[PDB]
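Re-running the complex after MR caught last week's input typo. The corrected sequence lines follow. Everything else is unchanged.
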Amino acid sequence: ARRVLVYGGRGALGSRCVQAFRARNWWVASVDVVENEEASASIIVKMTDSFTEQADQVTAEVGKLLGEEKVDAILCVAGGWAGGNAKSKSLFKNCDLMWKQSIWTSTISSHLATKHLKEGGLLTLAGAKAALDGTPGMIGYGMAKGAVHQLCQSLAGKNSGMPPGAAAIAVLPVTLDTPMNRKSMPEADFSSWTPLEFLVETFHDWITGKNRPSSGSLIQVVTTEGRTELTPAYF
Amino acid sequence: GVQVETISPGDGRTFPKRGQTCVVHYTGMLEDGKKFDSSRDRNKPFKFMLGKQEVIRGWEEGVAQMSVGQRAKLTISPDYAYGATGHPGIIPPHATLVFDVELLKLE
Ligand SMILES: CCC(C)(C)C(=O)C(=O)N1CCCC[C@H]1C(=O)N[C@H](CCc1ccc(OC)cc1)C(=O)NC[C@@H]1CC12CCN(c1nc(N[C@@H](CC(C)C)c3nc[nH]n3)nc(N3CCn4ncnc4C3)n1)CC2
Ligand SMILES: [Cl-]
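Corrected-run output:
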């Protein structure tokens, strides 16, 4: 590698990507709701209900930051979590949050990939193993992540706009080992949570061309007793 | 980080908890007093949940100190706000922000 854009660069996983990639002396841009002071450059997204407003603004700012330079990878690691079934009084607000944090971010990242990824470069998208099935207790989350899985399939297709030789791969974890999760779920089996450094080192391998899955892959990331395995799922 | 100054006191006993939703009206200004946004201009309060990384650190620490009905001035250093980069087009680089916040209720 040499240039990476981390979409979600201030989140738990995205902050670790910024740190690790800067430690390798890569140029790293963060796109998030606030800067990442560790990144080479930061782009700050507008809070708005207008998807086109937010998407046009980020696209313009990224285009000005990069100019004609292309990037080796876009790691779209944004996403949150908010729960609730279809009867919940919080359903509509939580769905709006989930669509903004997963659908909007993935879509903008995909467009940026067509415009700015080098030939042979990498786009990662943040899916969820749970959205391979019904998610009755987390309606918005499941819909958003299911949309991202489908988008990954589209990007692998002919004439999607992805550059020659580039790959879009979705990552489908269960739970990541993060400080916020350890304090939110202090009785869980952390040894079934995926270490952030496992994903950072996987991304580094994929960006550099080591053991890179085919475009359109849905890669399940499952940690069992501290050991993480990668398993393809098929849409 | 964040300085909290009381404009008018709250009930002095209902303070937010993690998991509760704070309902507020605010006006945000630059250090020179130039207004950049107000929820009052929309006649609609801003809502956020503490403990969920939903807001700049100065609000996360500042609003947690307020009781229901309090009106407070939060003066927030850049490292507790938008930092060196700022938010181009609305918040300048390394900006100290001042927010007038009224904690209307907890939901
Ligand atoms: C209207 C604003 C103006 C300027 C006029 C204003 O007056 C002003 O200043 N304020 C308004 C009044 C209050 C004071 C202040 C303020 O705080 N405003 C916030 C601005 C957002 C913010 C800023 C610093 C933060 O520090 C913790 C947290 C949040 C607001 O409106 N919050 C409520 C609106 C509903 C959300 C957006 C969705 N949601 C959320 N949370 C995270 N967490 C991140 C990680 C986290 C640690 C950064 C994540 N997790 C996976 N990756 N990154 N990320 C995202 N992204 C989606 C977009 N996107 N694109 C790329 N990456 C991403 C990740 N969205 C929760 C909050
Ligand atoms: Cl579920």
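None of the earlier attempt is carried over here. The first strand of chain B starts at residue 2 and ends at 8. Chain B touches chain A through nine residues (CB under 8 Å).
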